[PDB]
């Protein structure tokens, strides 16, 4: 679920998902169009694609379980949709951690009109 994703994001990065990743660049929190602004925004692009791979799942609300095996996220078995959602979220949280070094606060609340063009998944 979105709330679990946000807890995963905070755990990985120490930033709060709202506001650090809820309105960032072209794809975080409200993606759709545009060239992603940086690597963090590409994490969100890929995460959006990842959810897009699951048209009959409901990643905003469906809850999954995961645990940590020293540091590492391990998705626990739920329904097929929960497993696949968890793997999307795990990847994005790891991606955000891998790209913290280039996170830029100037992409928070990034205006829509600066995001133009479709980029295929």
């Amino acid at each position: 679920s979105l709330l679990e994703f946000g807890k995963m994001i905070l755990e990985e990065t120490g930033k709060l998902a709202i506001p650090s990743y809820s309105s960032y660049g072209c794809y975080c929190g409200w993606g759709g169009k545009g060239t992603p602004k940086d690597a963090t925004d590409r994490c969100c692009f890929v995460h959006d694609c990842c959810y897009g791979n699951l048209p009959d799942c409901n990643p905003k609300s469906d809850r999954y379980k995961y645990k940590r095996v020293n540091g590492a996220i391990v998705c626990e078995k739920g329904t097929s949709c929960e497993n696949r959602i968890c793997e999307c979220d795990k990847a994005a949280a790891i991606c955000f951690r891998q790209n913290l070094n280039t996170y830029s606060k100037k992409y928070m609340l990034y205006p829509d009109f600066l995001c133009k063009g479709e980029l295929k998944c």
């Binding site: 979105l2 709330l3 709202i18 809820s22 794809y27 975080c28 409200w30 759709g32 969100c44 959810y51």
Partner: peptide
């Protein structure tokens, strides 16, 4: 929270 695309 987030809630994109």
């Amino acid at each position: 929270v987030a809630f994109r695309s």
